[PDB]
Amino acid sequence: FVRAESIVAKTLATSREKERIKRVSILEDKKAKNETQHIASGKDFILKITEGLIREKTTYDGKPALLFIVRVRGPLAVNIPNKAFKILSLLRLVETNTGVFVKLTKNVYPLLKVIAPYVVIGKPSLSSIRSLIQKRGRIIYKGENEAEPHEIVLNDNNIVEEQLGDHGIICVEDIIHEIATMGESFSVCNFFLQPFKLNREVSGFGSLNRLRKIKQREAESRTRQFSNAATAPVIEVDIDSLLAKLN
Amino acid sequence: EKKERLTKEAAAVAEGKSKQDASPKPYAVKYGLNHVVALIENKKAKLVLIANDVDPIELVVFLPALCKKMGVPYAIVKGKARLGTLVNQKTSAVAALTEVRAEDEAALAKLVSTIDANFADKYDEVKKHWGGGILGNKAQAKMDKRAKNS
Amino acid sequence: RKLTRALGRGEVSSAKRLEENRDSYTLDHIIKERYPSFPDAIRDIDDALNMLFLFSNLPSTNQVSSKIINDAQKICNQWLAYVAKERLVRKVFVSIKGVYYQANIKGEEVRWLVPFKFPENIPSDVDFRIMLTFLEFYSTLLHFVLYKLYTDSGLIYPPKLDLKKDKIISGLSSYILESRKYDSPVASLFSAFVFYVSREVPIDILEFLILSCGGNVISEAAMDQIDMSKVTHQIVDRPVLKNKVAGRTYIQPQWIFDCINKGELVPANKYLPGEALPPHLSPW
Amino acid sequence: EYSGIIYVSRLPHGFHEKELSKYFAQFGDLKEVRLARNKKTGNSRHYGFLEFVNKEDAMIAQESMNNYLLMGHLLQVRVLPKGAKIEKLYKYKKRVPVKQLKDNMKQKHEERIKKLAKSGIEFKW
Amino acid sequence: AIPRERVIKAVNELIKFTSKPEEELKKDLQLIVVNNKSFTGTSKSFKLKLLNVKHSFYKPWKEASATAVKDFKVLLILKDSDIKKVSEDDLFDQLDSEGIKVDEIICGKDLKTVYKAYEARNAFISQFSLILADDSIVTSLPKLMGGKAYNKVETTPISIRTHANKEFSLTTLTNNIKKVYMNQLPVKLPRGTTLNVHLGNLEWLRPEEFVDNVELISEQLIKAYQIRSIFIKTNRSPVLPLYYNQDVLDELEAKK
Amino acid sequence: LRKLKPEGNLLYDTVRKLQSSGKVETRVPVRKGRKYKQKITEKWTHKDFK
RNA sequence: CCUUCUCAAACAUUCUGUUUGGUAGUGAGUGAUACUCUUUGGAGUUAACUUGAAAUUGCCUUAAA
């Protein structure tokens, strides 16, 4: 049975999401068209939430950089829209608690602005990416066998030779330098990396770990804000402290 | 919560010198049975709840009649531990509500309109019917086969 | 059970009250009655260190509770920083299953593994909680013996670690030492040397060796976020190399391996790749 | 005795024909459903109608959801007598020379001026 | 601009008209109306255009409701971070001096929690005639309070420059509210071409002040929206042309 | 050395060490199992709600 | 059984002034004052007044089990 209350709340939530995505999408459309007489505010903004918490708002003025993001579930009723299903299906973040890197720019900023409620965001550190890629990482690989229901963890840099020697690239440490320093175009690596299947920070359903689920939900609904203003800043956190839990 | 309230208000009355009303008013259910039945016949209730599962049923049988008399919107909840969950006792066997924050006034007032919808006409048929006229399956099959043969 | 009753009844403040108000178990009496104490402990820590350095490398998921992992990583790096600052390694042997070491710590020569920092894949055929329990016991064991070690040397135990270092390398530059001669000769080899390591080679086993055999280091990959002033050596394991300069010998790590494994400090003549190698010349 | 048709009431927002169809499929095969939308800035006036197929399906659904609850509307429902012939409520979405008219303005300026003059409220111009 | 003597005799004509033939309350409050070329179509704004005025009528309004029963009064709605910052002691220091008084202070969480029960919502706000809200909140309001407030211009909200950029403190707004009370008034702009404005009432300030007030707003409106023609009434009367501009009429099909 | 692919699962190997050195018994982790049906049927209340 | 577009610039400092843009709604009805269009088709704009959110007919996966 289908919980009529849940039906109507689902309808309301998806309609609200539809409103805000149409709002921000058409906002960005008229921004790009640059008829900017009627817009509440003409620029991006960036809230770097840190640790009742400590909030710092800034503007991009890119100066491009990278980011690392994770799909989190929610919010809490929704049958999804096509206008984010297509996006995150391209980006390979469904089947959640999954990690992918990204290069920031003005083409892609509003995509973060639409996906932001579904997702957590923040920049990584060198130790954090190094930990991530040495502990985790997988590969799709083909030849002499294996019609590809396939996955391979990183153990062979000769694979990096035979697939990225065309780029002059061996040595996933050298890949890491390319990533961290934003070297040669970042994109073979992003399209290749078979993105990270991180762990849920808490399995449970014992009476102890349920408590941690509740504390976790308190923390995430504290730090995240589905304000849906269409001018609000992006949200950025201490991912360095978070993926210590999540890795 | 009480002891935090006390260690607050001790400093509040020591420095701020209130009347021990610097702290705000509470808005809470009122859950002793004698408290409830005292409040009734002052009509200081807007909804009371009643638990079906009490084997010393003499404690409870007079309540729906009395609540009917005093015109208060009674309700027979199923489960007494369910009522204890909201007082932080194992069992309460009643709960009541007399004063509410404003932000659920409509909630309460409409809840009353559901409750009397569920009860006001059912009162005619609850009382004209002596429950428990039921048989077990063997006797039932016996009389069914008898009616079938006849 | 009490917590379960609580969460069924609601009472979540009381559930937090229960969880903060408990006192879990410890094993100090278990250790300091089972092992009398010091020589036996340092003799039989080998199987402890093996599983610890394994668990610090393998991935977090269910059955892991990665607080466990960061704890094991912390005590692992504490151990390595102590022994490398006090300059004790006696053998090294690279192999496919990581690398085995050898150190004459206070008498008996302890042998132990540190694997390659790479994403192993799990069978899901092994039973895990047994190994976790083993690990908890071994972690407590090493905590005790390492407190004893730092104290008898005399030191500020446990080591703090500066977050700006931990976020860039998360290495042995972290877990910094504060107090309160040597193994003669194989300590302080490469004395007054400087090795600029290439990014290409993994530091995960270079830096324990280099810091045990005293000499300062700088990494290529370390400066990705942010001098070659007095640099003496360059290391790389790449076929091609450029723009190589005259200030540094451009060498391989088997030079280091043979150098410490025989205490001879061989030159870099059979080196400067891509010429082939004296193949491993294992100690056994 | 009744008809299969049903009248419903006191609906909240977010509750549309799709919700009705998917929900009330559960009580049997539904024949056809229709609710009341405004023809102006189209949104619901919070009622509708339905017949699943059957009188018995109608009455059991009524017996179930007679005083059903959700947030702070509550559904009431009525089984009808025979027929009652749902007929209407097509669905409505949100509906979205100069000198000649200047002479029209100029003359009707005078027309309104004489009209207020003969009210009578006297005025020049 | 309009002949001011035409304005004078027009207001004298209106008051002597209505002086003799709930009813008087419906029929006495002055309204002023204007046609323009065309308003912003398919864009339903809810801001109010703030005119400058030399003499406000809200002081007469409180003086009149002191006798009457409706109790003309003010609302002030704030961000959630602000009620703790502000209090009634400060406005008691500030506003009674120049001779007004705030009635209450309130937040939007209270709006969505205790002024749900839409009956009680409208019953709460219909007590209030004058509404002051924040620039931050003005976009968020209509999901909260609803079009019953917005159809009437009394209830319909308005922004205010609260945040001294950045880290707001009270005085930057306590002077602004004094400005908007004493020396500024709102104007709404609906769809289409017509625009009515609830100017005031005839029991409030004399014609000799009303006349230059209407002159002020008319001369600042003829420049504002390229208006078409200007009239007045009080709540039944046909339209009184006091400015019918025709050079503005010729560009309409020139737009096409 | 960049060429080096390590090989051999240290979990399997150290578990062999455990079982070999007489610390633990040789075992599966083996998953669930039931002997009998643990019959389903309906509650009194859903049975007699009529 | 969710829970709401809860700030952006410009200037010169006055912690403070001018301007800029920022909302499409619970619906039901009550009577009623005026303006455009274009062909009757009235579509849109215009005072204020009630109602307990009221009511019968206007071409994704641990948020599981």
Coordinates of N, CA and C in Angstrom, one line a residue, chain A residues 45-50 56 67 121-123 223 233-239:
Chain A
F45 N 27.8 33.5 -5.3 CA 28.3 33.6 -3.9 C 28.6 32.3 -3.4
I46 N 29.5 32.3 -2.4 CA 30.1 31.1 -1.8 C 30.1 31.1 -0.3
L47 N 29.3 30.3 0.3 CA 29.3 30.2 1.8 C 30.1 29.0 2.2
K48 N 31.3 29.3 2.8 CA 32.2 28.3 3.3 C 31.8 28.0 4.8
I49 N 30.8 27.2 5.0 CA 30.4 26.8 6.4 C 31.5 26.1 7.0
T50 N 31.8 26.4 8.3 CA 32.9 25.8 9.0 C 32.6 25.7 10.5
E56 N 31.0 31.9 6.5 CA 31.8 32.9 5.7 C 31.3 32.9 4.2
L67 N 37.0 20.6 -7.1 CA 36.2 20.2 -6.0 C 36.0 18.7 -6.0
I121 N 29.3 19.3 -0.8 CA 30.3 19.9 -1.5 C 31.4 20.4 -0.6
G122 N 32.6 20.2 -1.1 CA 33.8 21.0 -0.6 C 35.0 20.5 -1.3
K123 N 36.1 21.3 -1.0 CA 37.4 21.1 -1.7 C 38.2 20.0 -0.9
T223 N 24.0 21.5 8.9 CA 25.0 22.2 8.0 C 24.4 22.5 6.6
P233 N 24.3 31.4 -1.5 CA 25.6 30.9 -1.8 C 25.6 29.4 -1.9
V234 N 26.7 28.9 -2.5 CA 27.0 27.5 -2.4 C 27.6 27.2 -1.0
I235 N 27.5 25.9 -0.7 CA 27.8 25.4 0.7 C 29.1 24.6 0.6
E236 N 30.0 24.8 1.5 CA 31.3 24.2 1.5 C 31.8 24.0 2.9
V237 N 32.4 22.8 3.1 CA 32.5 22.2 4.5 C 34.0 21.7 4.6
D238 N 34.3 21.1 5.8 CA 35.5 20.5 6.1 C 35.5 19.0 5.6
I239 N 35.6 18.9 4.3 CA 35.6 17.6 3.7 C 36.8 16.8 4.2

